[PDB]
Structure 1
Amino acid sequence: IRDENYFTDKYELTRTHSEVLEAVKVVKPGKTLDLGCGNGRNSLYLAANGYDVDAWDKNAMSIANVERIKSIENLDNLHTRVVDLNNLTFDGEYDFILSTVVLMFLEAKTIPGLIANMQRCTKPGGYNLIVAAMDTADYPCTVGFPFAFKEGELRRYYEGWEMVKYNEDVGELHRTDANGNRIKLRFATMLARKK
């Protein structure tokens, strides 16, 4: 059974993102863009559960790995591209576009146009899922991500969409090791539906 441990265990990948697992409880299978699929964990999970997925990332090796796994699992509905997100414009119509812990790694000048692109390429009634680090007065960014959302910023980006889920909750960077310190910081987490 293709659940959130299947690809994780079989192919040594980071576990399917929690927010994606939550999101498939409301977003029905449909045409999907995984913008910055990383190692493909989310793209694989989704393609294996009925979604028609376009998986894009800048890392050619990860994309080759995803292609390899695609062939073994016979996932005919998973299509990959190698792409530079800081230099990207795209056309299309998707029911679902996700971007989980990707944006903070992009140049700040990239964000406004990338988000605008995500939005015009979403079908009415479609969804966008975004998870990204923040930089706020009570938790200034201590990591030095080239980009981080300010308070209310992501919300405002999506004025006119329905906020199905939205929070700027305090999270943490943690390690599974004994002497591993935990860094608190805010993350912006949004499931938005387009009107």
Structure 2
Amino acid sequence: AMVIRDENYFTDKYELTRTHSEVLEAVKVVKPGKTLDLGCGNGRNSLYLAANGYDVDAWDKNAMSIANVERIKSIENLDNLHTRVVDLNNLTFDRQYDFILSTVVLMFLEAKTIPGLIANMQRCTKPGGYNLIVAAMDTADYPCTVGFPFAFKEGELRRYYEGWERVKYNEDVGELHRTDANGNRIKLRFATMLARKK
């Protein structure tokens, strides 16, 4: 009978990393609706959203991760969560979405993919709908020497989203989980954006 699905629910039951903070913020303004999670991983954001009345397409290239989302989906009876194993470097999609999110994924994709992928996300977003992106940057103050095949330049994500309402946009310094030669978390700027299409 206990129907609450908070940021502890999947985290504690299935040992997932807690729901991304920007997803927890986003849902304060983005109403439940049709959702697309690009590079869903082990599902921390897709399961949280499906459990809270969003209809979610959860896509990733890691078959083991998608099997894990499927397994949890079955246990929890999340009939509004739909998984696929895909390659974002060779994918085009056509449905209309209320909300598309890609959190800490785009830096793993080929540089040639990004302009077309961003264009596809923007085209597949309903007017009034939202896109949430968090991704690594490469800047003079914080070079990306981590080996990501892609990283945003300073101002680049802003420019992609020039005609959108930027509910949140920043390029703040964050940390990777991985550590450097001295065991200190690697520091990089990340483009974080929550944007609403006009």
CA contact (8 A) 2:178 2:186 kept: no
1:142-182 Cα shifts (integer Å, max 9, x gaps): 21211100000000001111111000011122469997312
Q: Residue 141 and residue 68 in structure 1: after superposition, are their counterparts in 2 closer, same or farther (change >3 A)?
A: same
SS of residue paired to 1:123? strand
> Cα–Cα, structure 1 residues 134 and 160, in superposed 2: closer, same or farther, change >3 Å?
same
**1:126 CA drift (Å):** 0.4
CA–CA distance in structure 2, aligned partners of residues 184 and 17 of structure 1: 18
Runs of 4+ in 1 over 3 A off after TM superposition: 174-180
Partners in 1 of 2:104 and 2:176 — Cα distance?
Answer: 12
1:76 and 1:154 map into 2 onto residues whose CA distance is 34
* SS, match of residue 95 in structure 2: coil
Once residues 188 and 66 of structure 2 are traced to their aligned partners in structure 1, the CA distance between those partners, rounded to angstroms, is: 30
Alignment gaps of 5+ in structure 2: none
Instruction: Please tell me whether the aligned partners of residues 105 and 146 of structure 1 are also in contact (alpha carbons under 8 angstroms).
Output: yes
* Whole-angstrom distance in 1 between the partners of 2:180 and 2:13: 23
- How many residue pairs were aligned? 195
Which residue of 58, 63, 66 maps to 2:66? 63
Provide TM-score, normalisation by structure 2: 0.94
Distance, in Å, in 2 between the alignment partners of 1:57 and 1:3 is: 23
For the 8 Å contact 1:106–1:147, the answer to whether it is kept is yes
Alignment partners' CA distance in 1, 2:7 and 2:188: 26
- 1:164 aligns with one of 163, 167, 181: 167
Q: Which runs of 5+ in 1 are unaligned?
A: none
Deviation at 1:32, TM superposition (A): 0.3
Q: Which residue of 1 aligns with 2:155?
A: 152
Q: Secondary structure at the match of 1:144?
A: coil
Contact 2:134/2:193, CA 8 A, preserved across alignment: yes
Alignment map for 1:63-142 (pairs within 5 Å): 63-142=66-145
